[PDB]
Symmetry: none
Subunit: 143 residues, 2 copies
Protein backbone atom coordinates (compact mmCIF):
# COMPACT_ATOMS: atom_id res chain seq x y z
CA UNK A 1 0.00 0.00 0.00
CA UNK A 2 1.14 3.64 0.59
CA UNK A 3 4.74 4.68 1.32
CA UNK A 4 3.57 6.59 4.47
CA UNK A 5 2.19 3.42 6.02
CA UNK A 6 5.32 1.51 5.08
CA UNK A 7 7.40 4.29 6.68
CA UNK A 8 5.46 4.28 9.97
CA UNK A 9 5.81 0.49 10.04
CA UNK A 10 9.56 0.66 9.33
CA UNK A 11 10.06 3.26 12.08
CA UNK A 12 8.04 1.14 14.54
CA UNK A 13 10.10 -1.82 13.53
CA UNK A 14 13.47 0.02 13.74
CA UNK A 15 14.32 -1.46 10.31
CA UNK A 16 14.83 0.22 6.89
CA UNK A 17 12.34 -0.13 4.01
CA UNK A 18 15.34 -1.33 2.04
CA UNK A 19 15.81 -4.30 4.49
CA UNK A 20 12.07 -4.89 4.94
CA UNK A 21 11.60 -5.13 1.15
CA UNK A 22 15.02 -6.76 0.61
CA UNK A 23 15.94 -4.32 -2.20
CA UNK A 24 19.27 -5.52 -3.61
CA UNK A 25 22.33 -3.40 -2.72
CA UNK A 26 23.40 -3.10 -6.33
CA UNK A 27 20.06 -1.44 -7.13
CA UNK A 28 20.38 1.02 -4.20
CA UNK A 29 23.97 1.81 -5.29
CA UNK A 30 22.78 2.55 -8.81
CA UNK A 31 20.12 5.04 -7.59
CA UNK A 32 22.71 6.68 -5.28
CA UNK A 33 25.22 6.94 -8.03
CA UNK A 34 22.61 8.62 -10.35
CA UNK A 35 21.51 10.90 -7.49
CA UNK A 36 25.09 11.99 -6.79
CA UNK A 37 25.59 12.65 -10.45
CA UNK A 38 22.71 15.22 -10.35
CA UNK A 39 24.18 16.79 -7.22
CA UNK A 40 27.70 17.18 -8.70
CA UNK A 41 26.39 18.58 -11.90
CA UNK A 42 24.60 21.21 -9.81
CA UNK A 43 21.03 19.92 -10.81
CA UNK A 44 19.72 20.41 -7.32
CA UNK A 45 15.95 20.01 -7.98
CA UNK A 46 16.48 16.54 -9.60
CA UNK A 47 19.08 15.55 -6.97
CA UNK A 48 16.64 16.40 -4.18
CA UNK A 49 13.93 13.96 -5.28
CA UNK A 50 16.47 11.18 -5.59
CA UNK A 51 18.00 11.89 -2.17
CA UNK A 52 14.67 12.25 -0.46
CA UNK A 53 13.66 8.82 -1.81
CA UNK A 54 17.03 7.37 -0.64
CA UNK A 55 16.71 8.61 2.92
CA UNK A 56 13.09 7.35 2.97
CA UNK A 57 14.25 3.84 1.90
CA UNK A 58 17.34 3.74 4.03
CA UNK A 59 17.07 6.20 6.93
CA UNK A 60 20.24 4.83 8.62
CA UNK A 61 22.47 5.50 5.66
CA UNK A 62 24.97 8.36 6.42
CA UNK A 63 25.84 8.98 2.78
CA UNK A 64 22.14 9.42 1.89
CA UNK A 65 21.43 11.65 4.85
CA UNK A 66 24.60 13.78 4.22
CA UNK A 67 23.66 14.12 0.60
CA UNK A 68 20.12 15.33 1.41
CA UNK A 69 21.40 17.62 4.26
CA UNK A 70 23.81 19.26 1.72
CA UNK A 71 20.86 19.82 -0.62
CA UNK A 72 18.74 21.48 2.07
CA UNK A 73 21.70 23.69 3.07
CA UNK A 74 22.17 24.76 -0.57
CA UNK A 75 18.36 25.60 -0.78
CA UNK A 76 18.80 27.56 2.45
CA UNK A 77 16.54 25.29 4.46
CA UNK A 78 19.05 25.66 7.28
CA UNK A 79 17.01 24.13 10.09
CA UNK A 80 16.16 20.97 8.13
CA UNK A 81 19.89 20.70 7.02
CA UNK A 82 21.03 21.07 10.60
CA UNK A 83 18.58 18.36 11.76
CA UNK A 84 19.79 15.89 9.18
CA UNK A 85 23.51 16.73 9.95
CA UNK A 86 22.90 15.96 13.56
CA UNK A 87 21.53 12.45 12.69
CA UNK A 88 24.51 11.91 10.31
CA UNK A 89 26.90 12.79 13.11
CA UNK A 90 25.12 10.53 15.63
CA UNK A 91 25.39 7.64 13.09
CA UNK A 92 29.07 8.37 12.34
CA UNK A 93 30.85 10.06 15.28
CA UNK A 94 34.34 9.79 13.70
CA UNK A 95 33.36 12.29 11.06
CA UNK A 96 33.21 16.01 11.96
CA UNK A 97 32.13 17.15 8.47
CA UNK A 98 28.43 17.20 9.66
CA UNK A 99 29.44 19.16 12.76
CA UNK A 100 31.21 21.68 10.51
CA UNK A 101 28.14 22.04 8.23
CA UNK A 102 25.83 22.41 11.19
CA UNK A 103 28.09 25.24 12.31
CA UNK A 104 27.51 26.99 9.00
CA UNK A 105 23.72 26.39 9.35
CA UNK A 106 23.63 27.78 12.88
CA UNK A 107 25.42 30.95 11.71
CA UNK A 108 22.81 31.44 8.99
CA UNK A 109 20.01 30.89 11.54
CA UNK A 110 21.59 33.72 13.58
CA UNK A 111 22.77 31.51 16.45
CA UNK A 112 26.46 32.57 16.38
CA UNK A 113 26.90 30.86 19.74
CA UNK A 114 25.76 27.45 18.73
CA UNK A 115 27.89 27.97 15.56
CA UNK A 116 31.07 28.73 17.54
CA UNK A 117 30.48 25.63 19.59
CA UNK A 118 30.32 23.42 16.44
CA UNK A 119 33.48 25.06 14.96
CA UNK A 120 35.35 24.46 18.26
CA UNK A 121 34.37 20.80 18.32
CA UNK A 122 35.79 20.44 14.80
CA UNK A 123 39.04 22.14 15.73
CA UNK A 124 39.23 20.07 18.87
CA UNK A 125 38.45 16.55 17.49
CA UNK A 126 38.64 16.45 13.70
CA UNK A 127 41.78 14.99 12.00
CA UNK A 128 40.81 16.67 8.71
CA UNK A 129 43.22 19.59 8.13
CA UNK A 130 41.03 21.30 5.50
CA UNK A 131 37.95 21.08 7.78
CA UNK A 132 39.97 22.55 10.64
CA UNK A 133 41.29 25.47 8.60
CA UNK A 134 37.71 26.29 7.47
CA UNK A 135 36.40 26.04 11.01
CA UNK A 136 39.25 28.25 12.33
CA UNK A 137 38.52 30.88 9.65
CA UNK A 138 34.82 30.99 10.70
CA UNK A 139 35.80 31.30 14.34
CA UNK A 140 38.15 34.19 13.50
CA UNK A 141 35.44 35.89 11.36
CA UNK A 142 32.73 35.63 14.03
CA UNK A 143 35.03 36.77 16.86
Amino acid sequence: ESISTAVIDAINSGATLKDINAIPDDMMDDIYSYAYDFYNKGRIEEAEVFFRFLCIYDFYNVDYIMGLAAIYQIKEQFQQAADLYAVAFALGKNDYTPVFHTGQCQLRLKAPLKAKECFELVIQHSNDEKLKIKAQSYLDAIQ
Copy 2:
Protein backbone atom coordinates in the same frame (compact mmCIF):
# COMPACT_ATOMS: atom_id res chain seq x y z
CA GLU B 1 15.05 4.43 16.24
CA SER B 2 14.27 7.96 17.53
CA ILE B 3 16.90 8.30 14.77
CA SER B 4 14.51 7.12 12.03
CA THR B 5 11.84 9.51 13.40
CA ALA B 6 14.33 12.38 13.28
CA VAL B 7 15.14 11.71 9.58
CA ILE B 8 11.46 11.43 8.54
CA ASP B 9 10.41 14.47 10.57
CA ALA B 10 13.16 16.54 9.06
CA ILE B 11 12.10 15.48 5.56
CA ASN B 12 8.42 16.06 6.33
CA SER B 13 8.91 19.62 7.52
CA GLY B 14 9.30 21.00 3.95
CA ALA B 15 6.28 21.42 1.63
CA THR B 16 6.41 19.50 -1.67
CA LEU B 17 4.71 20.26 -5.01
CA LYS B 18 2.09 17.62 -4.34
CA ASP B 19 1.59 18.79 -0.70
CA ILE B 20 0.34 22.22 -1.51
CA ASN B 21 -2.58 20.90 -3.66
CA ALA B 22 -2.43 23.57 -6.31
CA ILE B 23 -2.85 21.33 -9.31
CA PRO B 24 -6.21 19.71 -10.02
CA ASP B 25 -6.30 15.88 -10.35
CA ASP B 26 -7.80 15.88 -13.80
CA MET B 27 -5.06 18.20 -15.09
CA MET B 28 -2.51 15.69 -13.68
CA ASP B 29 -4.44 12.90 -15.48
CA ASP B 30 -4.52 14.85 -18.73
CA ILE B 31 -0.80 15.50 -18.55
CA TYR B 32 -0.15 11.79 -17.96
CA SER B 33 -2.52 10.76 -20.81
CA TYR B 34 -0.76 13.11 -23.25
CA ALA B 35 2.74 12.09 -22.14
CA TYR B 36 1.76 8.43 -22.56
CA ASP B 37 0.17 9.14 -26.03
CA PHE B 38 3.22 11.03 -27.14
CA TYR B 39 5.27 8.01 -26.15
CA ASN B 40 3.04 5.45 -28.03
CA LYS B 41 3.12 7.69 -31.06
CA GLY B 42 6.87 7.95 -31.16
CA ARG B 43 7.16 11.55 -30.09
CA ILE B 44 9.91 10.83 -27.63
CA GLU B 45 11.41 14.20 -26.80
CA GLU B 46 8.08 15.59 -25.75
CA ALA B 47 7.15 12.44 -23.83
CA GLU B 48 10.48 12.64 -22.05
CA VAL B 49 9.94 16.24 -20.85
CA PHE B 50 6.48 15.57 -19.51
CA PHE B 51 7.26 12.25 -17.85
CA ARG B 52 10.21 13.93 -16.15
CA PHE B 53 7.91 16.70 -14.92
CA LEU B 54 5.59 13.99 -13.65
CA CYS B 55 8.41 12.21 -11.80
CA ILE B 56 9.37 15.44 -10.04
CA TYR B 57 5.75 16.15 -9.04
CA ASP B 58 5.23 12.61 -7.58
CA PHE B 59 8.41 10.51 -7.57
CA TYR B 60 6.54 7.75 -5.66
CA ASN B 61 4.14 7.10 -8.54
CA VAL B 62 5.30 3.94 -10.29
CA ASP B 63 3.51 4.79 -13.50
CA TYR B 64 5.51 8.00 -13.78
CA ILE B 65 8.82 6.25 -13.04
CA MET B 66 8.13 3.32 -15.45
CA GLY B 67 7.08 5.85 -18.05
CA LEU B 68 10.42 7.69 -17.98
CA ALA B 69 12.38 4.42 -17.50
CA ALA B 70 10.82 3.05 -20.73
CA ILE B 71 11.74 6.25 -22.61
CA TYR B 72 15.40 5.94 -21.54
CA GLN B 73 15.33 2.28 -22.60
CA ILE B 74 13.96 3.17 -26.03
CA LYS B 75 16.56 5.91 -26.35
CA GLU B 76 19.27 3.37 -25.46
CA GLN B 77 20.20 5.19 -22.29
CA PHE B 78 20.45 1.82 -20.61
CA GLN B 79 22.11 2.88 -17.35
CA GLN B 80 19.57 5.66 -16.71
CA ALA B 81 16.73 3.27 -17.60
CA ALA B 82 18.15 0.69 -15.18
CA ASP B 83 18.47 3.34 -12.42
CA LEU B 84 14.80 4.31 -12.77
CA TYR B 85 13.69 0.63 -13.02
CA ALA B 86 15.41 0.14 -9.63
CA VAL B 87 13.31 2.96 -8.22
CA ALA B 88 10.16 1.37 -9.75
CA PHE B 89 11.04 -1.95 -8.18
CA ALA B 90 11.52 -0.39 -4.78
CA LEU B 91 8.21 1.46 -5.10
CA GLY B 92 6.43 -1.60 -6.39
CA LYS B 93 4.46 -4.32 -4.68
CA ASN B 94 6.35 -7.51 -5.72
CA ASP B 95 6.11 -6.46 -9.36
CA TYR B 96 9.03 -7.93 -11.23
CA THR B 97 8.47 -6.15 -14.51
CA PRO B 98 11.10 -3.45 -13.72
CA VAL B 99 13.58 -6.27 -12.74
CA PHE B 100 13.00 -7.88 -16.10
CA HIS B 101 13.60 -4.62 -17.99
CA THR B 102 16.70 -4.06 -15.83
CA GLY B 103 17.94 -7.48 -17.09
CA GLN B 104 17.53 -6.37 -20.68
CA CYS B 105 19.39 -3.11 -19.88
CA GLN B 106 22.22 -4.97 -18.11
CA LEU B 107 22.56 -7.29 -21.06
CA ARG B 108 22.85 -4.32 -23.37
CA LEU B 109 25.40 -2.75 -21.02
CA LYS B 110 27.50 -5.93 -21.56
CA ALA B 111 26.95 -7.01 -17.93
CA PRO B 112 25.62 -10.58 -18.66
CA LEU B 113 26.10 -11.71 -15.05
CA LYS B 114 24.00 -8.86 -13.81
CA ALA B 115 21.43 -9.55 -16.55
CA LYS B 116 21.30 -13.23 -15.51
CA GLU B 117 20.66 -12.30 -11.86
CA CYS B 118 17.75 -10.07 -12.90
CA PHE B 119 16.15 -12.78 -15.06
CA GLU B 120 16.79 -15.40 -12.34
CA LEU B 121 15.13 -13.15 -9.84
CA VAL B 122 12.05 -12.78 -12.11
CA ILE B 123 11.77 -16.57 -12.56
CA GLN B 124 12.14 -17.15 -8.83
CA HIS B 125 9.58 -14.61 -7.56
CA SER B 126 7.36 -13.42 -10.27
CA ASN B 127 3.81 -14.62 -10.62
CA ASP B 128 3.42 -13.29 -14.17
CA GLU B 129 3.69 -16.14 -16.66
CA LYS B 130 4.34 -14.14 -19.77
CA LEU B 131 7.12 -12.37 -17.90
CA LYS B 132 8.74 -15.64 -16.69
CA ILE B 133 8.62 -17.04 -20.19
CA LYS B 134 10.55 -14.02 -21.54
CA ALA B 135 12.98 -14.14 -18.65
CA GLN B 136 13.61 -17.96 -19.17
CA SER B 137 14.29 -17.34 -22.83
CA TYR B 138 16.83 -14.64 -22.06
CA LEU B 139 18.50 -16.92 -19.49
CA ASP B 140 18.68 -19.75 -22.10
CA ALA B 141 20.12 -17.45 -24.78
CA ILE B 142 22.82 -16.13 -22.40
CA GLN B 143 23.94 -19.54 -20.98
